[PDB]
Amino acid sequence: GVILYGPPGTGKTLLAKAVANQTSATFLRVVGSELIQKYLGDGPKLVRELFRVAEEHAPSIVFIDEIDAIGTKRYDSNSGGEREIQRTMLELLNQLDGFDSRGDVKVIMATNRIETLDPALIRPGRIDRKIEFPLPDEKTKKRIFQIHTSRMTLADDVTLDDLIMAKDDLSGADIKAICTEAGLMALRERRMKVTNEDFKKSKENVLYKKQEGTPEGL
Amino acid sequence: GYDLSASTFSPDGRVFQVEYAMKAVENSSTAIGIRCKDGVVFGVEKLVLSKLYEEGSNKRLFNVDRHVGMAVAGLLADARSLADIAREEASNFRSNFGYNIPLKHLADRVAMYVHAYTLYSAVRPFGCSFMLGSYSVNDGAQLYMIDPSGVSYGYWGCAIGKARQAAKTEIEKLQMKEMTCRDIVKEVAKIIYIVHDEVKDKAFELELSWVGELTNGRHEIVPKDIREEAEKYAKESLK
Amino acid sequence: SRRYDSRTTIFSPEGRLYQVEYAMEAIGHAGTCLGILANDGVLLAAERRNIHKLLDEVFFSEKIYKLNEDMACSVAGITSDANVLTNELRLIAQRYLLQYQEPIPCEQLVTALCDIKQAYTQFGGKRPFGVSLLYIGWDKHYGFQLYQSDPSGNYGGWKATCIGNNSAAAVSMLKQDYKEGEMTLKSALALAIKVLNKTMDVSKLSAEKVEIATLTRENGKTVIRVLKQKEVEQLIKKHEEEEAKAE
Amino acid sequence: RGSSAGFDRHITIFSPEGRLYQVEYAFKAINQGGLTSVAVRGKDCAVIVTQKKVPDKLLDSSTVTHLFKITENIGCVMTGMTADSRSQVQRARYEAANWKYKYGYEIPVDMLCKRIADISQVYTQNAEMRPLGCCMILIGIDEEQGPQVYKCDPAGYYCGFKATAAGVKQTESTSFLEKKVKKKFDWTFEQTVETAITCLSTVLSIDFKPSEIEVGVVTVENPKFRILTEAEIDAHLVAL
Amino acid sequence: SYDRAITVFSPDGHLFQVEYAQEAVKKGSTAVGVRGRDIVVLGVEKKSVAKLQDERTVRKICALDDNVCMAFAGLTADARIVINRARVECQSHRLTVEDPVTVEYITRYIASLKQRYTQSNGRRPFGISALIVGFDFDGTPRLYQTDPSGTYHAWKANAIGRGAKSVREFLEKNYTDEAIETDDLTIKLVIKALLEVVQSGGKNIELAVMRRDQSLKILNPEEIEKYVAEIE
Amino acid sequence: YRGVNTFSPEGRLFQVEYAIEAIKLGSTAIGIQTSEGVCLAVEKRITSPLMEPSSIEKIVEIDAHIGCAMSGLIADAKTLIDKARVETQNHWFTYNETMTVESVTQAVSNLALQFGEEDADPGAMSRPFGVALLFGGVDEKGPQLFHMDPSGTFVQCDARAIGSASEGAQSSLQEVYHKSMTLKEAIKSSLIILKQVMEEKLNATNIELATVQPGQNFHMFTKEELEEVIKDI
Amino acid sequence: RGYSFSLTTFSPSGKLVQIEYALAAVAGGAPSVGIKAANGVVLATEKKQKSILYDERSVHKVEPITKHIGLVYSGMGPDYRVLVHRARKLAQQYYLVYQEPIPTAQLVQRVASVMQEYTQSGGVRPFGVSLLICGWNEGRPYLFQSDPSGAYFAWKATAMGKNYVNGKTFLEKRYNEDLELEDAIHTAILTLKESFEGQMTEDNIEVGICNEAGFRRLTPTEVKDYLAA
Amino acid sequence: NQYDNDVTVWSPQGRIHQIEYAMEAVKQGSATVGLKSKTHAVLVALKRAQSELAAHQKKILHVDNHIGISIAGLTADARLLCNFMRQECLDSRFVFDRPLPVSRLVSLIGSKTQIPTQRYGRRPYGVGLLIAGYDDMGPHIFQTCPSANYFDCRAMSIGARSQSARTYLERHMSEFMECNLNELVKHGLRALRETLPAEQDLTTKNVSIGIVGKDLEFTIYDDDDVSPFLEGL
Ligand SMILES: Nc1ncnc2c1ncn2[C@@H]1O[C@H](COP(=O)(O)OP(=O)(O)OP(=O)(O)O)[C@@H](O)[C@H]1O
Ligand SMILES: [Mg+2]
């Protein structure tokens, strides 16, 4: 199995989607919070089925996104429904590598926060490959920008580099947000084309969702 | 989580740590005190854990002053600390007010000292119950008791320890009111033998004491000859 | 007892003091505060939250505080922690004055208070002070000044700032419409009235839901004043008239 | 209504509903003894009566009690935990002695109750220690105020009363006494001693004997607090 | 007095408070330092002018003694505390020994203070890392770095803070006798290395330079831009 | 939760065990005792070239006739060294004699473990020192080598190895060392075991070595002297 | 020894929760009122005892501090006693230093500052009480409130305790700055009456006033007379 | 689970668990023995070495000219208690110009060990002593456990595997009062041998002996000085 880990908005789910739509097996997707069930012994049933209709279907892939919501450090001093979370985690831990042979299936996983997973879930025989996902640095930013601005009529004053040069630690999802917001205000003003001033204003607006305590921590 | 400190009441109005400490006092062997016309008599069953100990190991009767005695049951470390505190109270009283401490006042001071250990989280209740008994021409014979909760109550006969109920059912028959220490001694050995369980525990050697008109008001270990005769009479009574 | 301890002075697993973060989170709900340093004055513009018809008028102000003859400060956060910090600031000023017979410079003072606050968030087991300060003053070293403090103990000189509710918006306009070094006291007051009118989205400046302060040098000595009702309302009328002519 | 937020049921801190649960439980412990007491205020006499349970014939009945003298003039009943009761009685005796040492005249009942309730309030603010599980009732003659009857509880409430009961049977006794005080005057002679005995007998449904209660009295003619003996108690018991 | 043990050992032998202190240190603007033949130079990164802060009240390179200076990366309040303490100790040294303080002495002192707060009761470790530079009386160039654990070493070129691994790799590949021959070459080297994290430069950097007797040198924005250009 | 001064169900202070774990993070140090003297060898462990190797003071002298080698944390030793030195000097002041090796080890050992949380001092120590020292020196009784652990437990050793590779190093030291070594042979064997453990190839720059002999005081090996020993090594 | 750590701590939303719970306790007590007439200041609360067996005169809720300034509360009782004692002590310290009667604003500041300390100090919980103080200093009436958080507010007229929101609505209806002392005390008596759950007998309410003559409680016969209307 | 985290938290069965874990720490140590005759008292100990190059840990110390102890458990605690005992004995000599009676010293020891087990945050003394002394009442042997509970024994054997030793002691208790010093020492050595694990014999390298008597200060035999006692077994 391969576990995709990295900072939020960096291309995990997208790469899984791609290797899904490009390959020739039955690719199945699940959200971790969708395994948190409100009747006892339903989460384990769900995981057992999910791995049951994957050998019925020839080569198969499973991608359990946002696994962090289900696999956590496994602190024992906890009460409530967390015990059920741990019990479903044990069921998964057995399915991946346990008594029987897993047949022909692969397991991909994603987690924005990975330091908090359980050692037995991401151990070598369960997940051999582990992939870090860094942010775009300087040029992948140019690539993504030209990817999302691809389908829109832009004015001939678009200083894209001027938007990219800033070391604002922008993320891929942030780039998509900037593209969409700029396009939307261009629609608002009726203007048949999108202008650089619109893109910079949109950049300022999107980054406006950062907050935090400035001097603190630095 | 309502039983982790003595600074918390149970939802039904109880301080559990004190209840547990008082439970501990029912794992130690049995002690007895009987008040009579002449004076007081303490008798304790001392279990011999191993054959390798000396005679008189961990004596469970102490002398807190020249006229006062002290029987204990439970944790021995707590018993010895409380013996130290009672000695200190007696010495301070003599130095301040110029005469031997009346026993009631000593019981009160010691009990307050114990009770102060059953209010705070920073300390834990003493695991020992004990009985003080003295005799004077004026105040006569007295016998008191103080439990881990710090309650002091006078007694005509009491048994603190494991087999406290059996002895209590036994001590009730003496009519101690109208005898003297000399016969109370034989009675005390008799009871301490009646209550002893030979199936569970292996063997014991008695510790006996008294304070009464026969000592001029001095608490002191009962002499060897009288102790042996008492033991022999108790043995015969256990046909 | 370790069972009930809160550990208000221990690092989190990413090196961030949580009690401090929450303290700064409390400030973002109290009244807004504004700083504007002119070339001939300094001015504090906070919002009067105690807006009820049954409150009484007392004292020369309600949020502005004097600290020396030549220094004043306004508060955002808890009122009681505010009082405690104000008292300690007054004491610091007088202790410096007693030792040196000179008025305490402004960064002398602000760093003394912030040192108390930082120490308080370093060891002791207490909760930190949930207050953020704005100060104003003059001293022969740097002239008119405008500082700011936070629950952490960090301060900063600001040509224009905003600490409290809607801080992001206020600092956004303050960035858009500040002439560095090209501001008279009158222009700064007008800019304050405008920015606050934005921020106090609830109604418009009622001339009574606001507090303004001015620190100036007059006749060689500092003079501190809190704007009365008539002048404030006149300023607001001028502001509305200017905006109307503009449209 | 009954929410819990953290340790609100372990140390003396507020619950989401502004409730101190530890003080409430402490009040619950006053009943752990299994005893009750009543006090009644007469025109020239104030009386306090209480049960006296000799669990068996090995205790010395003279020692088990719940009446104590704070001063020669002020005497009190203690109900609930016994050790806590002794602690509070010692503190009261020390406080009265200090009052006379410092201010040159004997301590008023109300002011002693106030000092002791303040002590308990400190106990119910700080969280290191726990509130005591005992309640007081005091009685004595004031110089220009007539007979006084006062009580205090773990939380620190020190109301002064015309006729009172404390213990397991607080509510039944209080109801009876409220009705009496409604009738004519709540007893208006030294035979207020009979009303208290009747209240206890009715509430507990006991039909007392001479050796199952202990009384204390204070009279305007004889201000010094006096602890009614067995012969006098039997005389009063026959009277009704 | 509050007397709980904040920093405590953990299975596998880790001072988690110390580790979290350095995790805080990793949230501070990058600071850099290099050592040349006859000049040391300290380089920092300013977060942003903001057009409204007074950069005079925000200084990030401070002087501890006329011949010793320091730069930090982490929390600010802790930095202020350590700087004042070091200043007091330098002055006490001057008064008692009648000879100028030496860089190793003050670095040792600061590291000891950090260790103390790392092993005392009711105290949170400093989340700051320092870079002390200077010349001893003998006129020898020196560079020391102090971690929040109380450890110190001497360096030819280390970068502390955000992005420290990158700048350290750059300096390690590039540091050679050629780059210290000319004081300008060293200043420009530090400027270039920093320029691997910061964006704008000129208006997004501060520099500091010190010579044998020459006092602390703060490079003005115009001169810094000129230096970058000459590098250009 | 789980105070510092707490006993595990086995009968071991937890904090002490965790402190004993921290000695494995430290570099590997060796010491050998011979009639002609005692030697200390340690690994400097230069992380990156950019740092002055001379600035890793990881062996210090307690007195002219004592030597100390440490493993664990840098910062934790410093106070133990100062205590050892002030104790040596105190003894010289009072008795005009030279503080012995077992005695300085004992004093340093006592200074360890006096940690707690309740009613100690305004600023007493909290957690146990996480460092394992090696005292070696020449006393009125001849060459001595003592080994200290975070538990306040010290014992005089004939050859000891402490640090990340202490195991394996110890098997080697046990196979080689005999009762009649020579000082120079001891330096050679120690340097060889060190070379065998370090990840990096041994060079005069990334180690330190010190010997103390009856005649000469505690001696630090110099770069050239180090090269001279390493070349034939 | 005693706990050396604060028991009120900030929450993720930046709210000191224990203070909120103390405020809840205050809001769940007996009602109280205070008005500032042009020539006097009136406080008045409700003292409904639980049976016929309580001596109305045994204790009082409206208590003076000096001859010219006094206070009442709503909340818990024992906390009110402690705060009364602390206020009297602080007043006497001010008199001893300055030889002049303490101004009401300063006494309120000082008692409140004492109230803050218990929100932050170690091993203690906030007071479950709010006070109102009345004074006649500088020929001028003063009405202040002080809450568990240590905050104070100057009031023209206020009503705290159970059903305090409706009371504040009432008083908002009935304030007239040119009011006179007798009318003010009458309006107060009414406000308590707005919610009382019974008949307001002379022995079920308290009042206290302040004017030039001096703060002074009202004797029950006076109370009955005023209640006549 | 929650009743074994502090020493002040009674367990619902009337047991404090921390004290029992401290007892465990005392039981994990190396074996030791004590005897008394009508004329002498002899301690016999079994040191053990961490490795084959390190020395065997000392486990008999001096207190006074008429008292001796033998430890088993954490050393640092044993050192602390030795400090206490020696200070008490010296104070008795300074004030009263007279040896301290042994029983009183053991009582002070118990009281000092009692305070930790009743205060929050303090921990029991994790050491087990075997005090041998000679007062005006003659020979004495005592035992001390982490719970502040001392015992007046005539023979005992604390430490690891000590139960077979105790069996041999209880087996031959009749002779101890009439024995010569040599026979007493041989009884002690023989028991401590019963403790040894099969293929391991008593040697000069793993034994120490202490003795006190009528006209004989407390003296420690170790190393080759023990050979005269061993030769004969
Ligand atoms: N390198 C990239 N090329 C194309 N699109 C990208 C790239 N990086 C990010 N995106 C955009 O990021 C958007 C977010 O979806 P994506 O699958 O990348 O999320 P993710 O990284 O898995 O997020 P999360 O960590 O929250 O699970 C995608 O719609 C895609 O448009
Ligand atoms: Mg993602």
CA-based nearest residue to H43, from H214, H143, H175, H185: H185
Phi-psi region of H221 (alpha: psi -120 to 50; beta: other; left: phi over 0): beta
* Nearest-atom index, ligand 1, CA of A112: 25
CA-based nearest residue to H17, from B24, D92, F115, C236: B24
Residue range D1-240, CATH number: 3.60.20.10
Helices (H), chain C: 18-27, 79-100, 106-122, 167-176, 185-199, 229-246
Neighbours of H186 (CB within 10 A): 18
Q: Which CA distances in Å does D200 have to D36, D163, D170?
A: 8, 12, 10
Q: Which CA distances in Å does E22 have to D109, E29, E106?
A: 64, 13, 21
C-alpha of residue A171 to centroid of ligand 1, in Å: 9
Three-state secondary structure readout of G54-80: ECCCCCCCCEEEECCEEEEEEECHHHH
Domain boundaries, chain E: 1-232
Indicate the residue type of C5. Answer: D
Indicate the residue type of C54. Answer: L
CA angle G207, G210, G215 (to 5 degrees): 85
Rounded to the nearest angstrom, the minimum Cα separation between C19 and chain B is 27
Chains touching chain B, criterion 3+ CB pairs below 8 Å: C, D, H
C-alpha of residue A121 to centroid of ligand 2, in Å: 19
Residue A134 assigned ligand-binding role: no
**Residue whose structure tokens are 């007491």:** D37
Which tokens belong to F199?
């990840």
Residue B117 φ then ψ, to 5°: -95, 10
- 132-171 in chain F: CB under 8 A from chain H: 147, 151-153, 155-160, 170
Which tokens belong to E103?
């860089």
Domain boundaries, chain D: 1-240
B123 at interface of C, judged by CB pairs closer than 8 A = no
Residue A26 assigned ligand-binding role: no
Which residues of chain B make contact with H14, given a CB cutoff of 8 A? 20-21, 23-27, 127
Beta strands across the sheet bearing G63-66: G63-66, G69-75, G129-137, G140-146, G152-154
**Could you tell me if B200 and B163 are in contact, meaning their C-beta atoms sit under 8 angstroms apart?**
no
User: Nearest residue CA, atom 25 of ligand 1?
Assistant: A8
Structural class in CATH, domain B1-237: alpha beta
Indicate the residue type of E26. Answer: K
CA E168 to chain centroid, in Å, comes to 14
CATH architecture group of domain G1-229: 4-Layer Sandwich (3.60)
Neighbours of B34 (CB within 10 A): 28
Rounded CA-CA distance E220/E204 in Å is 12
Q: Ligand 1: does its nearest atom lie under 6 Å from the Cβ of A147?
A: yes
Which residues of chain B make contact with C1, given a CB cutoff of 8 A? 5, 121
Q: Which CA distances in Å does A192 have to A176, A183, A185, A195, A196?
A: 20, 10, 11, 10, 14
Domain of C102? 1-247
Q: Which ligand is nearest to the CA of A171?
A: 1
Count interface pairs D-G at CB distance under 8 A: 98
- 170-189 in chain G: CB under 8 A from chain C: 171-172, 175
- By most ligand atoms within 8 Å of CB, the mutation choice from A2, A5, A13 for ligand 1 is A13
Which tokens belong to G182?
């007798």
E3 at interface of G, judged by CB pairs closer than 8 A = yes
- Strand pairing partners for H213? H40, H216
By the 10 Å C-beta count (0-12 exposed, 13-18 middle, 19+ buried), H125 is classed as buried
Domain boundaries, chain G: 1-229
- Which residues lie below 8 Å from residue D227, measured CB to CB, with a gap of 6+? D67, D69, D75, D214, D215, D216
C-alpha distance across the termini of chain A, in Å: 39
**Could you tell me if B22 and B129 are in contact, meaning their C-beta atoms sit under 8 angstroms apart?**
yes
**Could you tell me if B153 and B135 are in contact, meaning their C-beta atoms sit under 8 angstroms apart?**
no
Residue H17 sits in a domain whose CATH number is 3.60.20.10
C-alpha of residue A161 to centroid of ligand 2, in Å: 25
DSSP state of H184: H
**Could you tell me if G74 and G48 are in contact, meaning their C-beta atoms sit under 8 angstroms apart?**
no
C-alpha distance across the termini of chain B, in Å: 51
C-alpha of residue A177 to centroid of ligand 1, in Å: 11
Residue F66 φ then ψ, to 5°: -125, 155
Rounded CA-CA distance G20/G14 in Å is 12
By the 10 Å C-beta count (0-12 exposed, 13-18 middle, 19+ buried), E117 is classed as buried
When scoring B124, B126, B128, B207 by the number of chain H Cβ atoms within 10 A, the one with the most, hence best to mutate, is B124
Q: Which CA distances in Å does G24 have to C230, D16, D126?
A: 40, 8, 20
**Could you tell me if D63 and D73 are in contact, meaning their C-beta atoms sit under 8 angstroms apart?**
no
CATH architecture group of domain E1-232: 4-Layer Sandwich (3.60)
CA-based nearest residue to F142, from F209, F212, F87: F212
Indicate the residue type of D235. Answer: A
**Could you tell me if C132 and C164 are in contact, meaning their C-beta atoms sit under 8 angstroms apart?**
yes
By the 10 Å C-beta count (0-12 exposed, 13-18 middle, 19+ buried), B66 is classed as middle
Helices F74-95 and E103-119: angle between axes, nearest 10 degrees? 100
Which tokens belong to E177?
């006798």
**Could you tell me if D30 and D166 are in contact, meaning their C-beta atoms sit under 8 angstroms apart?**
yes
Helices G181-194 and G220-228: angle between axes, nearest 10 degrees? 90
Asked if A touches E (at least 3 Cβ pairs < 8 angstroms), the answer reads yes
Rounded CA-CA distance A3/A129 in Å is 7
Rounded to the nearest angstrom, the minimum Cα separation between E98 and chain F is 24
* CB-CB under 8 Å, A165 with E27: no
Which residues of chain D make contact with B15, given a CB cutoff of 8 A? 130
Instruction: Tell me the torsion sign for CA atoms G129, G135, G137, G142.
Output: positive
Rounded to the nearest angstrom, the minimum Cα separation between C103 and chain D is 42
Rounded CA-CA distance E213/F67 in Å is 39
Which tokens belong to G223?
């109370």
Neighbours of ion ligand 2 (CB under 5 A): A 12
Three-state secondary structure readout of chain D: CCCCCCCCCCCCCCCCCCCCHHHHHHHHHHHHCCCEEEEEECCCEEEEEEECCCCCCCECCCCCCCEEECCCCCEEEEEECHHHHHHHHHHHHHHHHHHHHHHCCCCCHHHHHHHHHHHHHHHHHCCCECCCCEEEEEEEEECCCEEEEEEECCCCCCCEECEEEEECCHHHHHHHHHHHHHHCCCCCCCCHHHHHHHHHHHHHCCCCCCCCEEEEEEECCCCCCEEECHHHHHHHHHHC
Three-state secondary structure readout of C98-161: HHHCCCCCHHHHHHHHHHHHHHHHHECCCCCCCEEEEEEECCCCCCCECCEECCCCCECCECEE
Q: Give the SS3 label for residue A137.
A: coil
**Could you tell me if H146 and H5 are in contact, meaning their C-beta atoms sit under 8 angstroms apart?**
no
Q: Give the SS3 label for residue C76.
A: strand
Domains: count for chain H = 1
Q: Ligand 1: does its nearest atom lie under 6 Å from the Cβ of A43?
A: no
CA-based nearest residue to F26, from F77, F73, F68, F67: F73
**Could you tell me if F36 and E139 are in contact, meaning their C-beta atoms sit under 8 angstroms apart?**
no
Rounded to the nearest angstrom, the minimum Cα separation between H194 and chain F is 25
**Residue whose structure tokens are 């000044």:** C145
CA-based nearest residue to F101, from F47, F64, F150, F151: F64
Rounded CA-CA distance D223/D227 in Å is 12
Domains: count for chain C = 1
- Which residues lie below 8 Å from residue A154, measured CB to CB, with a gap of 6+? A193, A194, A195
- Provide DSSP, F24-82: GTSPPEEEEEETTEEEEEEE---SSTTB-GGG---EEEEETTEEEEEES-HHHHHHHHH
**Residue whose structure tokens are 């001595």:** F144
Rounded CA-CA distance B212/B36 in Å is 9
Q: Ligand 1: does its nearest atom lie under 6 Å from the Cβ of A173?
A: yes
Chain G residue with the nearest C-alpha to that of E3? G4
Residue C35 sits in a domain whose CATH number is 3.60.20.10
CA G205 to chain centroid, in Å, comes to 14
- Strand pairing partners for H127? H73
C22 at interface of G, judged by CB pairs closer than 8 A = yes
- What is the Cβ-side half-sphere exposure of residue E29, based on CA atoms within 13 angstroms? 23
CA angle A164, A166, A169 (to 5 degrees): 90
Rounded CA-CA distance D139/D217 in Å is 8
Residue A10 assigned ligand-binding role: yes
Which tokens belong to B80?
């010895």
CA angle H198, H199, H200 (to 5 degrees): 95
Beta strands across the sheet bearing E128-135: E61-65, E68-74, E128-135, E141-146, E152-154
| H or E, element range at B133 | strand B128-136
Rounded CA-CA distance G95/G103 in Å is 10
Residue A52 φ then ψ, to 5°: -95, -45
Facing residue for G21 by CB, picked from D11, D18, D156: D18
CA-based nearest residue to A146, from A135, A161, A167, A168: A161
Rounded CA-CA distance F83/F67 in Å is 14
